[PDB]
Design a protein around this motif. Structure first.
Motif, PDB file in Angstrom:
ATOM      1  N   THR A  66       5.792   4.798   6.515  1.00 53.61           N
ATOM      2  CA  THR A  66       5.709   4.376   5.131  1.00 53.61           C
ATOM      3  C   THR A  66       6.108   2.921   5.088  1.00 53.61           C
ATOM      4  O   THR A  66       6.821   2.456   5.976  1.00 53.61           O
ATOM      5  N   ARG A  67       5.642   2.184   4.089  1.00 54.40           N
ATOM      6  CA  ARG A  67       6.088   0.809   3.948  1.00 54.40           C
ATOM      7  C   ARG A  67       6.992   0.965   2.758  1.00 54.40           C
ATOM      8  O   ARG A  67       6.517   1.138   1.651  1.00 54.40           O
ATOM      9  N   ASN A  68       8.295   0.959   2.993  1.00 55.88           N
ATOM     10  CA  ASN A  68       9.256   1.120   1.918  1.00 55.88           C
ATOM     11  C   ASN A  68       9.198   2.513   1.298  1.00 55.88           C
ATOM     12  O   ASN A  68       9.168   2.645   0.084  1.00 55.88           O
ATOM     13  N   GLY A  69       9.178   3.551   2.121  1.00 61.28           N
ATOM     14  CA  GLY A  69       9.149   4.899   1.587  1.00 61.28           C
ATOM     15  C   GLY A  69       7.817   5.378   1.026  1.00 61.28           C
ATOM     16  O   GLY A  69       7.746   6.481   0.468  1.00 61.28           O
ATOM     17  N   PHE A  70       6.761   4.573   1.154  1.00 54.64           N
ATOM     18  CA  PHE A  70       5.434   4.973   0.649  1.00 54.64           C
ATOM     19  C   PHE A  70       4.298   4.689   1.632  1.00 54.64           C
ATOM     20  O   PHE A  70       4.345   3.709   2.390  1.00 54.64           O
ATOM     21  N   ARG A  71       3.285   5.555   1.608  1.00 53.77           N
ATOM     22  CA  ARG A  71       2.109   5.409   2.464  1.00 53.77           C
ATOM     23  C   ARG A  71       1.298   4.280   1.818  1.00 53.77           C
ATOM     24  O   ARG A  71       1.325   4.143   0.598  1.00 53.77           O
ATOM     25  N   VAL A  72       0.631   3.439   2.603  1.00 54.91           N
ATOM     26  CA  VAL A  72      -0.167   2.386   1.992  1.00 54.91           C
ATOM     27  C   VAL A  72      -1.579   2.941   1.839  1.00 54.91           C
ATOM     28  O   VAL A  72      -2.022   3.745   2.668  1.00 54.91           O
ATOM     29  N   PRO A  73      -2.308   2.510   0.789  1.00 58.84           N
ATOM     30  CA  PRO A  73      -3.671   2.936   0.484  1.00 58.84           C
ATOM     31  C   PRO A  73      -4.722   2.308   1.382  1.00 58.84           C
ATOM     32  O   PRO A  73      -4.510   1.240   1.962  1.00 58.84           O
ATOM     33  N   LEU A  74      -5.855   2.979   1.512  1.00 60.05           N
ATOM     34  CA  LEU A  74      -6.907   2.449   2.349  1.00 60.05           C
ATOM     35  C   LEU A  74      -7.495   1.235   1.654  1.00 60.05           C
ATOM     36  O   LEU A  74      -7.652   1.230   0.430  1.00 60.05           O
ATOM     37  N   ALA A  75      -7.840   0.215   2.431  1.00 57.58           N
ATOM     38  CA  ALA A  75      -8.409  -1.010   1.878  1.00 57.58           C
ATOM     39  C   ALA A  75      -9.654  -0.713   1.034  1.00 57.58           C
ATOM     40  O   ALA A  75      -9.857  -1.313  -0.008  1.00 57.58           O
ATOM     41  N   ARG A  76     -10.476   0.228   1.487  1.00 57.64           N
ATOM     42  CA  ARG A  76     -11.709   0.595   0.775  1.00 57.64           C
ATOM     43  C   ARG A  76     -11.449   1.431  -0.482  1.00 57.64           C
ATOM     44  O   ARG A  76     -12.304   1.483  -1.365  1.00 57.64           O
ATOM     45  N   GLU A  77     -10.297   2.100  -0.569  1.00 55.06           N
ATOM     46  CA  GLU A  77     -10.005   2.864  -1.780  1.00 55.06           C
ATOM     47  C   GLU A  77      -9.471   1.799  -2.723  1.00 55.06           C
ATOM     48  O   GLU A  77      -9.817   1.778  -3.910  1.00 55.06           O
ATOM     49  N   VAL A  78      -8.653   0.883  -2.195  1.00 51.96           N
ATOM     50  CA  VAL A  78      -8.155  -0.197  -3.050  1.00 51.96           C
ATOM     51  C   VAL A  78      -9.395  -0.891  -3.557  1.00 51.96           C
ATOM     52  O   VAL A  78      -9.440  -1.336  -4.706  1.00 51.96           O
ATOM     53  N   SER A  79     -10.406  -0.976  -2.698  1.00 46.92           N
ATOM     54  CA  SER A  79     -11.642  -1.646  -3.065  1.00 46.92           C
ATOM     55  C   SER A  79     -12.450  -0.899  -4.126  1.00 46.92           C
ATOM     56  O   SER A  79     -12.797  -1.481  -5.162  1.00 46.92           O
TER      57      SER A  79
END
Ligand code: HEM
Ligand SMILES: *[C@H]1O[C@H](CO)[C@@H](O[C@@H]2O[C@H](CO)[C@@H](O[C@H]3O[C@H](CO)[C@@H](O)[C@H](O)[C@@H]3O)[C@H](O)[C@H]2NC(C)=O)[C@H](O)[C@H]1NC(C)=O
Ligand SMILES: *[C@H]1O[C@H](CO)[C@@H](O[C@@H]2O[C@H](CO)[C@@H](O[C@H]3O[C@H](CO)[C@@H](O)[C@H](O)[C@@H]3O)[C@H](O)[C@H]2NC(C)=O)[C@H](O)[C@H]1NC(C)=O
Ligand SMILES: *[C@@H]1O[C@H](CO)[C@@H](O[C@@H]2O[C@H](CO)[C@@H](O)[C@H](O)[C@H]2NC(C)=O)[C@H](O)[C@H]1NC(C)=O
Ligand SMILES: *[C@@H]1O[C@H](CO)[C@@H](O[C@@H]2O[C@H](CO)[C@@H](O)[C@H](O)[C@H]2NC(C)=O)[C@H](O)[C@H]1NC(C)=O
Ligand code: CA
Length: 595
Positions: A66-79
């Motif tokens: 996790t980055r600070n206790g959280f999973r980071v989102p996929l670049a394409r979902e962010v997209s």
């Protein structure tokens, strides 16, 4: 707090104490330490790189880190959830020409290129990545969400190999990973002339003694020149139309033919170098090749320095322009030359400025031809539309009379770049510049948005309501938060481009700070700066700020009707005027009367 000197991937060869023009590679600009700003050295770090393993892995690499206790989102979902939009209506910038976007990308290419890690081109390195979508070593594939139409039509992922890092290329392991800048941190035209020795002079016309760059021999544009063709097959400008078989151009910078408009811009630049070399032999009949080359190069760089700092920056920076780039006090030599890693991501605000189409206009600025307006995605590495469909006058007119896209928090990047991008080796017009941008902040181990806000002495949110207030936008902040759980995890890229634009600028606070600081620095720490006393002679200097991108257009194309201000929004009959009501670059102050 360390790391004193990893200066491996460079040949050591040392300096020249006059050599009256820069070195092609940028070394020797700075005397105390030589390398500072030299190409193929490491992008500077304004902050400790932030990686999964504190060393090299990109956040979003291992499932359960996790980055600070959280999973980071996929670049394409962010997209797909924030960056794209359907409607290209109402998206243009009523007050910025297509040239505004063009110059940005241009300046961009002069200062920074973080080349993809080669590490083997007679390997599966390639197949294992796109074809089977396996993550490994430098194959950091962009995975699809589900609900993502690309699942049903392209596969499980898009390609994304990590960037060149220094010291070796071979796999490191004990303190931080630093990507390389393969061009000179200096605003010096390295994009026209080269950033390596090797390429400077392949670009040169050594065959004759006048001082120009090699111009095309297979083809002409009216009486004007065309950048020299490029050598290497596979050539992507050959791949979009296998029938037309027109290759990509050859210039000081490798991405020149990404799209027709940059290639175009690149063409205006060479002609001006040759133009500068005739007037000079003319005036100084005795000066040799080298001398009309470095002195042209010398004026050309100065020219790019003034348009960018005198015409472009005040309109990107807006109100934030003096706060970081107070006027010129001359060369401080403690100042750092080195383009910073985050700048390379901050400068991509330009991606929100590309419209979905490009036009060709004729002498009364109307549709030149039947199929005049075209989708941007048909212009990627498309050179043929130039030599076999009209030359660059037509396109320069579109640069002059069409508008850029405007960042819109609800219409960030156009689908021509977001779902239909073409990448030199991946055959489909099917990629995404947004996702790629995001996967890369991670690749470069970027610190989050709040680290950068902190750094810029800006407030840092930790809640939806807080993120809302700063973005002056509620559902953007709500979406941003749902994907990231805390603004601490927001990728510098979209993070910085979500902030409303400042007064009279085209970027927000966060970006104006990051941008402003870099340019202040590449100018102040530049020993060959044109205002830098002694660097130029005083009339030679009064000649210069009379230069203009409008005048650049006249001396080098058969366009005889230009706008006084090339970057502002300009419509034809009206904001146009003949080329003779225009300031020329008078070169009699360069006249050597050694007789
Ligand atoms: C139609 C126009 C453009 C296209 C199709 C395009 C596409 C791309 C792509 C695929 C990258 C790869 C970076 C990565 O993978 O991380 C890139 C980087 C970049 N572009 Fe865009 N770009 C365009 C226009 C521009 C413009 C107009 C500007 C400036 C005003 C600009 C500035 C940059 C910068 C600064 C980078 C990072 C370069 C580095 O490595 O230092 N670009 N572009
Ligand atoms: C790749 O480039 C091809 C070669 O230039 C291009 O074909 C050329 O472009 C069009 C094809 O639609 C033709 O243009 C028109 O020429 C005049 C006026 O422009 C008209 O009277 C013609 O009827 C025609 O519409 C060119 O003649 C044509 N040339 C050749 C040799 O085919 C292809 O369209 C491009 N291919 C792709 C996939 O983009
Ligand atoms: C939106 O875009 C225009 C730019 O394309 C913008 O124009 C800029 O606005 C500033 C302030 O009004 C003006 O300032 C310049 O001119 C003053 C004249 O006294 C000089 O002292 C300064 O050097 C300064 O550069 C400019 O006229 C303009 N800046 C420049 C360099 O052009 C307009 O406000 C808007 N455009 C439209 C069509 O509404
Ligand atoms: C280097 O410069 C010379 C001069 O322009 C080039 O030779 C000229 O070629 C054009 C036609 O290709 C004609 O004007 C003459 O044949 C030559 N002119 C002169 C004045 O000599 C030479 O080819 C150049 N090389 C490149 C790659 O640009
Ligand atoms: C040259 O650039 C350096 C580095 O950017 C500047 O260093 C500053 O000088 C102050 C003086 O007290 C030091 O305490 C700090 O390290 C820096 N502070 C600030 C606010 O810049 C320096 O200002 C520049 N020198 C010149 C002549 O411009
Ligand atoms: Ca440069």
């Amino acid at each position: 707090s360390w790391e004193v000197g990893c200066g491996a991937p460079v040949p050591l060869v040392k300096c020249d104490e006059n050599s009256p023009y820069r070195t092609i590679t940028g070394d020797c600009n700075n005397r105390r330490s030589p390398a500072l700003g030299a190409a193929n050295r490491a992008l500077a770090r304004w902050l400790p790189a932030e990686y999964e393993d504190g060393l090299a892995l990109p956040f979003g690499w291992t499932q359960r880190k996790t980055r600070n206790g959280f999973r980071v989102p996929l670049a394409r979902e962010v997209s797909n959830k924030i960056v794209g939009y359907l409607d290209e209506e109402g998206v243009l910038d009523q007050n910025r020409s297509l040239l505004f976007m063009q110059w940005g990308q241009i300046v961009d290419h002069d200062l920074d290129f973080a080349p993809e890690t080669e590490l083997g081109s007679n390997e599966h390195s390639k197949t294992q990545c796109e074809e089977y979508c396996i993550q490994g070593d430098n194959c950091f594939p962009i995975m699809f969400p589900k609900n993502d139409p690309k699942l049903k039509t392209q596969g499980k992922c898009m390609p994304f190999f990590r960037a060149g890092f220094v010291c070796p290329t071979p796999p490191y392991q004990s303190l931080a990973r630093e990507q390389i800048n393969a061009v000179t941190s200096f605003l010096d035209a390295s994009l026209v002339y080269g950033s390596e020795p090797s390429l400077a002079s392949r670009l040169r016309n050594l065959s004759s003694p006048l001082g120009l760059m090699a111009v095309n021999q297979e083809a002409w544009d009216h009486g004007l020149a065309y950048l020299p063709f490029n050598n290497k097959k596979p050539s992507p400008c050959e791949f979009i139309n296998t029938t037309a078989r027109v290759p990509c151009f050859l210039a000081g910078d490798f991405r020149a033919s990404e799209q027709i408009l940059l290639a175009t811009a690149h063409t205006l630049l060479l002609r001006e170098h040759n133009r500068l070399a005739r007037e000079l032999k003319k005036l100084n009949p005795h000066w040799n090749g080298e001398k009309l080359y470095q002195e042209a190069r010398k004026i050309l760089g100065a020219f790019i320095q003034i348009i960018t700092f005198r015409d472009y920056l005040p309109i990107v920076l807006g109100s934030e322009m003096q706060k970081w780039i107070p006027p010129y006090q001359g060369y401080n030599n403690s100042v750092d030359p080195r383009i910073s890693n985050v700048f390379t991501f901050a400068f991509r605000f330009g991606h929100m400025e590309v419209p979905s189409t490009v036009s060709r206009l004729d002498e009364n600025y109307q549709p030149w031809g039947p199929e005049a307006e075209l989708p941007l995605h048909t212009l990627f590495f498309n050179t043929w539309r130039i030599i076999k469909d009209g030359g660059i006058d037509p396109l320069v007119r579109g640069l002059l009379a069409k508008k850029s896209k405007l960042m819109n928090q609800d219409k960030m990047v156009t689908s021509e770049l977001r779902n239909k991008l073409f990448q030199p080796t991946h055959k489909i017009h099917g990629f995404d510049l947004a996702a790629i941008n995001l996967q890369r902040c991670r690749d470069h181990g970027m610190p989050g948005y709040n680290s950068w806000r902190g750094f810029c002495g800006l407030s840092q949110p930790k809640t939806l309501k807080g993120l809302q207030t700063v973005l002056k936008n509620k559902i953007l902040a709500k979406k941003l938060m749902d994907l990231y759980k805390t603004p601490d995890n927001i990728d510098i890229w979209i993070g910085g481009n979500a902030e409303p634009m400042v007064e009279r600028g085209r970027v927000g606070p966060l970006l104006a700070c990051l941008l402003g600081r870099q340019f202040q620095q590449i100018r102040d720490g530049d020993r060959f700066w044109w205002e830098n006393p002694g660097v130029f002679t005083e009339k030679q200097r009064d000649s210069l700020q009379k230069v203009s991108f409008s005048r650049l257009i006249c001396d080098n194309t058969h366009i005889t009707k230009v706008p006084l201000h090339a970057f502002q929004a300009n419509n034809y009959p009206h904001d146009f005027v003949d080329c003779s009501t225009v300031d020329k670059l008078d070169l009699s102050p360069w006249a050597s009367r050694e007789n």
